[PDB]
Write a protein that binds this ligand. Sequence first.
Ligand SMILES: *[C@@H]1O[C@H](CO)[C@@H](O[C@@H]2O[C@H](CO)[C@@H](O[C@@H]3O[C@H](CO[C@H]4O[C@H](CO)[C@@H](O)[C@H](O)[C@@H]4O)[C@@H](O)[C@H](O[C@H]4O[C@H](CO)[C@@H](O)[C@H](O)[C@@H]4O)[C@@H]3O)[C@H](O)[C@H]2NC(C)=O)[C@H](O)[C@H]1NC(C)=O
Lengths: 53, 438
Amino acid sequence: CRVPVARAPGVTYGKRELTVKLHPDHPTLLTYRSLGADPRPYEEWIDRYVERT
Amino acid sequence: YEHTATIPNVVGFPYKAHIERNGFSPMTLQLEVLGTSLEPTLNLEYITCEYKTVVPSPYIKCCGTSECRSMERPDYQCQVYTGVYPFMWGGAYCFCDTENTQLSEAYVDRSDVCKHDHAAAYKAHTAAMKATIRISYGNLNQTTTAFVNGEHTVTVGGSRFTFGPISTAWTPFDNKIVVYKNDVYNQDFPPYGSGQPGRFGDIQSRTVESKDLYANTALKLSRPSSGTVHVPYTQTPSSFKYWIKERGTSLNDKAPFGCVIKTNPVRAENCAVGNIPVSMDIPDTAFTRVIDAPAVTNLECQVAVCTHSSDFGGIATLTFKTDKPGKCAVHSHSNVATIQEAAVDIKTDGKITLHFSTASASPAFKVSVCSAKTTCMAACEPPKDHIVPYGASHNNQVFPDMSGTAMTWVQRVAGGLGGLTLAAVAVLILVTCVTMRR
Ligand SMILES: *[C@@H]1O[C@H](CO)[C@@H](O[C@@H]2O[C@H](CO)[C@@H](O[C@@H]3O[C@H](CO[C@H]4O[C@H](CO)[C@@H](O)[C@H](O)[C@@H]4O)[C@@H](O)[C@H](O[C@H]4O[C@H](CO)[C@@H](O)[C@H](O)[C@@H]4O)[C@@H]3O)[C@H](O)[C@H]2NC(C)=O)[C@H](O)[C@H]1NC(C)=O
């Protein structure tokens, strides 16, 4: 089949923190996890212009 | 010749092992892992598809009656009614007012695409880790694969290696596994013969093609209404289409140690845990005799830069008194810095350059070039970039040795009041030996 890609999100580097800026055109999915001893999964259907850390 | 070592498990991390023996030049190795799978020892408990209920055409009878059948079928249920008045399309259909029954029948089985898409349920009790280490020494680069347990043995060129057991026995799975198409789910599935309607496991067959289907989808077969010809029923919906939506994530998106989870020979490739022991069997026709090696005297190192960056952010400079050109093999006798490239080419003038990488403010590593050693000390500075796209090449060690500037002030407080404490003792020793007797 065929599926569109999302825009590349803008990032801003901080001390032990990463602020990423998001831009959807339709409901897309977000997932990150810490690849160390203990994972911390987060998942949310982003709908509008938001901004996360 | 025999030699053992242990390597950390992180992928893309060239490790150096050092070999010393009497009568030959020292020699360094370069082990570097390139991939690691982890297959559990599967056995299919069952397999799950999306069912298909087949309601055939309802058989009326216009004057007589009919009876039940009691056929053999997974969720079979048929039951007959009293007199019904069909009234099909033009006028009536049996041309009486009563005593005309309508037998109804329905059952369930597996799908028609059940051999194409399916969830597969396994059990992970043991696991056998493979690997893809490449091996570098002299003028020889090979790449071999081996089951990582302490008995399989592979050969490389003219030498032989074997890899010991994995240190821990940790699995990213658990004893339960659910494999649909590209996403193993670490969920405790309900067992065989105890399926529940609506939730995952409503239809269950032991293998891909067999008889003896198992199903309880709560098929209920109600009574037909006024004069139309239809067989009505009611049923709990397909569980497997709830589980395609109500699946939260995969296990690829909540795996513990940062490991991708492939699916077809169900795998757990590229984990990061523990360490791997090795065993060497390098024969004698790989070294150089000590006469043929270039003699090195009077080493002296002198650092230049030393930042704390995760790559090789440090350049040292060494001087020496050689006698002939050749090719040495450098090594670091500490876990504080890791010298890169391991294979310098000595020339007539006494000047070479290296590249190392630390993680603390003051190192104390010591360098051997060709059977001759010296010690290096540096004053290092922290970097500026906060988030880096690559990993970590050093070892995680933050401790100034004994003579760093941050620890020099400790000895000028320890020797100060500590030397004054014994001076307050030495007054009391004189008093408790002169005027305990006079
Ligand atoms: C030791 O063993 C190997 C046996 O293969 C030999 O050394 C290998 O040599 C091959 C090439 O012959 C190396 O493979 C390729 O090297 C290319 C050169 O790298 C330059 O470009 C990259 C990219 O900009 C720079 O980062 C780098 O600094 C160099 O300027 C790479 O371009 C190749 O990239 C490929 O893979 C990447 C993903 O990693 C893809 O994105 C690319 O599109 C491309 O497909 C590739 O890396 C290989 O790295 C060498 N292995 C070593 C040194 O271990 C030697 O012959 C052998 N030793 C002796 C003495 O014989």
